[PDB]
Amino acid sequence: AVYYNSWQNLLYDSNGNIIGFKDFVTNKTYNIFPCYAGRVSAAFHQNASSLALLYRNLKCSYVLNNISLTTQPYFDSYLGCVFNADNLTDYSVSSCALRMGSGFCVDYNSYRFVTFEPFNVSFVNDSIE
Amino acid sequence: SVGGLYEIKIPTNFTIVGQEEFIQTNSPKVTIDCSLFVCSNYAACHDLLSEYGTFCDNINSILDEVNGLLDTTQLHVADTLMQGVTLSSNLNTNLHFDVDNINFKSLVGCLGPHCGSSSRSFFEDLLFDKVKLSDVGFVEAYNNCTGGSEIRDLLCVQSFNGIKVLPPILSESQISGYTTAATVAAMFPPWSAAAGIPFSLNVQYRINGLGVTMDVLNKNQKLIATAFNNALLSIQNGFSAPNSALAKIQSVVNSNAQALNSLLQQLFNKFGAISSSLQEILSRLDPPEAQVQIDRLINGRLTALNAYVSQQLSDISLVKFGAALAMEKVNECVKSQSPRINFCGNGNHILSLVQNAPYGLLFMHFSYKPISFKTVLVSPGLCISGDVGIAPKQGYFIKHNDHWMFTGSSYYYPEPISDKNVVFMNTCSVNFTKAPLVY
Amino acid sequence: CTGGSEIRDLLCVQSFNGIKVLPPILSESQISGYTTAATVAAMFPPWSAAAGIPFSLNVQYRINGLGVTMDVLNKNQKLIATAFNNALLSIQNGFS
Amino acid sequence: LSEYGTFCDNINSILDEVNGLLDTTQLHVADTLMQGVTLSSNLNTNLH
Amino acid sequence: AQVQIDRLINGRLTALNAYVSQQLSDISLVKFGAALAMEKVNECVKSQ
Amino acid sequence: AQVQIDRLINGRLTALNAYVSQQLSDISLVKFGAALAMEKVNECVKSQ
Amino acid sequence: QYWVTPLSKRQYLLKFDNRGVITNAVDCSSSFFSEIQCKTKSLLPNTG
Amino acid sequence: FTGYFPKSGANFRDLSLKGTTYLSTLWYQKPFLSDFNNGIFSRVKNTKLYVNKTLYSEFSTIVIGSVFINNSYTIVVQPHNGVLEITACQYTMCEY
Ligand SMILES: CC(=O)N[C@H]1[C@H]([C@H](O)[C@H](O)COC(C)=O)O[C@@](O[C@H](CO)[C@@H](O)[C@@H]2O[C@@](O)(C(=O)O)C[C@H](O)[C@H]2NC(C)=O)(C(=O)O)C[C@@H]1O
Ligand SMILES: *[C@@H]1O[C@H](CO)[C@@H](O[C@@H]2O[C@H](CO)[C@@H](O)[C@H](O)[C@H]2NC(C)=O)[C@H](O)[C@H]1NC(C)=O
Ligand SMILES: *[C@@H]1O[C@H](CO)[C@@H](O[C@@H]2O[C@H](CO)[C@@H](O)[C@H](O)[C@H]2NC(C)=O)[C@H](O)[C@H]1NC(C)=O
Ligand SMILES: *[C@@H]1O[C@H](CO)[C@@H](O[C@@H]2O[C@H](CO)[C@@H](O)[C@H](O)[C@H]2NC(C)=O)[C@H](O)[C@H]1NC(C)=O
Ligand SMILES: *[C@@H]1O[C@H](CO)[C@@H](O)[C@H](O)[C@H]1NC(C)=O
Ligand SMILES: *[C@@H]1O[C@H](CO)[C@@H](O)[C@H](O)[C@H]1NC(C)=O
Ligand SMILES: *[C@@H]1O[C@H](CO)[C@@H](O)[C@H](O)[C@H]1NC(C)=O
Ligand SMILES: *[C@@H]1O[C@H](CO)[C@@H](O)[C@H](O)[C@H]1NC(C)=O
Ligand SMILES: *[C@@H]1O[C@H](CO)[C@@H](O)[C@H](O)[C@H]1NC(C)=O
Hints:
The first copy, chain A, is mainly beta. Chain A has one helix at residues 60-66; strands at 10-12, 18-22, 29-31, 41-43, 52-56, 74-77, 80-83, 85-93, 99-101, 104-108, 111-116, 122-124.
């Protein structure tokens, strides 16, 4: 940074929060960012002995390296990292009790991350012309 | 009235005008974590917030019910778009995009699951690229919160404070697929969304029902088709300039961003306490007085959440009303033409079409617009033969070449009087022009 | 509120305490002009708010559509018009 | 009251939005009343 | 005096919040009634 | 005792305002549902 | 030239550029336009 | 931000006085001798003079105090051509 004059050592936002500073000893400048905070979207089925967890908008590398390690299988879905559910987006269901958003569903037999397609066209093989 | 005739301006030429109408059928699904919003990470606040008990359970429950109402509403809108849609498996939108000189290439996206999420029309692409915070926009913005970027996205600050917008249960790509299916259902057999007849014939019969003779319609078919796709092009080009429908779409995103930012600003209100920061209170005071200051912040933040939840309940009630209106417009303007005059936009409504839009549906209403007029003398009825009364059907009686003839009320084309364009009466009403020489 | 009136209007107390009713963007006189225009649009040519036909004929065709033969309906035109204006007078007198 | 922050700004903003909805609604009602209305310039209140 | 004035500020702000919530709810009914009135104009006065 | 009872009164009254605001919203939805039911009676049951 | 003016405890809207320099300022209670600028926290308020 | 700021739209007063030999006794009374109250904001012209084309900076010295007697501290802000000498001392101030 180049905005600190001789008498300045703290950077403030419009709300009065400290968002950056210049160290008085080393003169090195740093930006301050809030630590990650969020929720876990857990999908549960009454017949299951476990949960399907969705860390919304988080990559699985980020969850395992910076939130918590786990032994459950995982994959990067469109909605975020999904734990304890098989990636089966090529499969579809017309009814869904665990709707995760953006046309995605959690289906329990294990849990399956499946596309949600509540409506489809009635097809006929008649000529178009 | 001179004699038994009145002066009326009857159209001598016409065009088709297209009108946009955005109806909001959905809104961003805002979720608050009441515990994380009120108390952040601070154990001294969480201990006190537990003594307010069910206030956070009520905030969470009311927003979960509100989001459930939005999800149910989106499913009802999608069910309405796909209701009765039957398509041929031989339909390939890459080759099949125009019929009877009417072009729907811009209104129709790729059809079938082989495309994946690419089932969005050129019209919908052009309408979605002007709105940053759509469902995919929110997902991409929240994905970037842990990307290590120096940019302080306001959505990232809101989400870290427990304020996050969840994606709708059906993606806007699925809804665009449903609007695409509803649109092609009008262009090809079995025409399941166009009264079971070809689209050009449905447009012709709808224009004829306004009081236009079929003789000019079946000879000006090229002019009608060109006026129709020109009206569609006018609608598409209207989004490149300040537009009321695009402004209405952007108002949904702007009002939501303003409400969420206003809710986040409550975390910086002191509410009469020494500071709005829990860290400053806990670093200045011991538990006997820190609890007093923290209680002031808890009451202020919970009051702000009750106010936001009351505003959200009111806004979602307006969205349910708008979604009910959009479902009614789909059923009574696109899939069919209900006998309601100004329901499907203003003017002489011919037909309507629907396209997906961020948080709603965009309807294109096509109307019969007169270009030039001829002032003529009309008779609303005639007394003929043995005092038998006749009234014109969707038209007027005209003295053309000193002989009584009929013309449609919406297009000047004098044609012979017959049982096809007349309502008979055994007795003629007073003031009906006397014409013993007719029929 | 600024007049030399001895009567304490409750609205003046409310306005001085910050609570005030602002007038609508369109005056009720403008809306009355619009309802007047909508009403005369049914009486005279081109009958733009009466399906493009005279008001009496629109009343007659509307009554015929209920299952009333056109014969008694056009022979009793003055009785129908007097019944219509008597109904309108009854609505006006009902406000008293 | 200045130490309460945005409380009065929120109250003014919500009432301004409510009044904007009432104004927009009145314009829509007026547009609906006047839609498609064509009158002759020969109309006179004192004769017709 | 600050303690007493603070109790009045909290009561008066709570009252304004309650009034604003009621006003939003009532304007929703006004919008519904205006929609019904526009529909009645279009489908009972301008046409049948 | 007055201080402790004032905390309970403010909490109980705040919760009563929240319940009243929720009830107003729910009854507005019931009015919309009843209007739809009257339309269905008139246009599906008594006539088509 | 030695121009002097009295100081007083006043609320000001201070605008800082991308390099931290105060480029513009508004004395909030000086005039009606200054009150609009401070209310909207901007030098050029929207048309309204 | 709330701080010690000038009132916008108020009037600045040019209190600078230049003399050659004579000093008017009226220059040392009201309104020149002004009340301090909370404080003052000064906009000072740097009178850039030249001797043998060499630049020299001059401007009026300001004194801030109460009674200006050696029983009291008087603050003095005085320029010395690029050096701003600021002192606060029990000065025995002159009458003029
Ligand atoms: C506060 C004020 O009003 N200040 C002005 C000052 C006074 O009115 C004057 O001092 C008062 O006097 C009393 C109290 O008796 O007058 C000045 O202007 C003079 C003419 O008015 C100036 O030209 C001088 O003229 C000479 O004839 C002379 O001796 O006055 C010769 C001298 O060499 C020359 N000074 C030079 C060369 O700078 C000045 O300077 O003094 C300009 C100042 O802005
Ligand atoms: C950190 O930055 C400050 C400010 O530039 C440095 O302080 C200056 O140091 C020089 C050399 O001793 C002095 O001539 C200046 O007068 C100092 N300025 C001030 C404001 O104190 C300081 O030396 C730097 N320290 C490091 C470790 O980089
Ligand atoms: C999750 O499953 C889907 C569906 O099988 C994967 O997407 C397919 O990936 C293959 C390559 O391995 C492509 O050829 C297909 O075209 C993709 N299909 C679709 C519908 O996109 C997806 O890659 C899987 N993701 C993970 C992280 O396992
Ligand atoms: C009548 O049928 C013909 C033949 O199917 C149609 O002609 C095609 O029209 C498209 C435009 O929609 C042209 O691009 C093609 O080149 C035409 N093909 C041929 C073989 O002529 C015509 O559109 C139909 N017209 C109507 C009004 O039904
Ligand atoms: C869950 O278990 C019950 C009882 O065995 C059964 O009726 C139901 O069909 C099961 N559903 C699923 C998804 O397994
Ligand atoms: C819609 O999809 C489901 C699941 O693939 C299928 O059972 C159903 O038969 C489909 N609809 C039609 C009309 O065939
Ligand atoms: C359409 O499907 C039916 C039923 O399977 C079959 O009898 C018919 O031959 C098919 N026609 C074509 C053109 O595929
Ligand atoms: C109708 O109007 C268009 C546009 O002005 C014109 O090109 C066309 O020739 C007109 N046709 C008739 C019959 O006047
Ligand atoms: C997300 O981050 C990438 C990489 O910095 C950037 O290209 C993209 O525009 C960002 N999108 C959003 C919505 O923030």
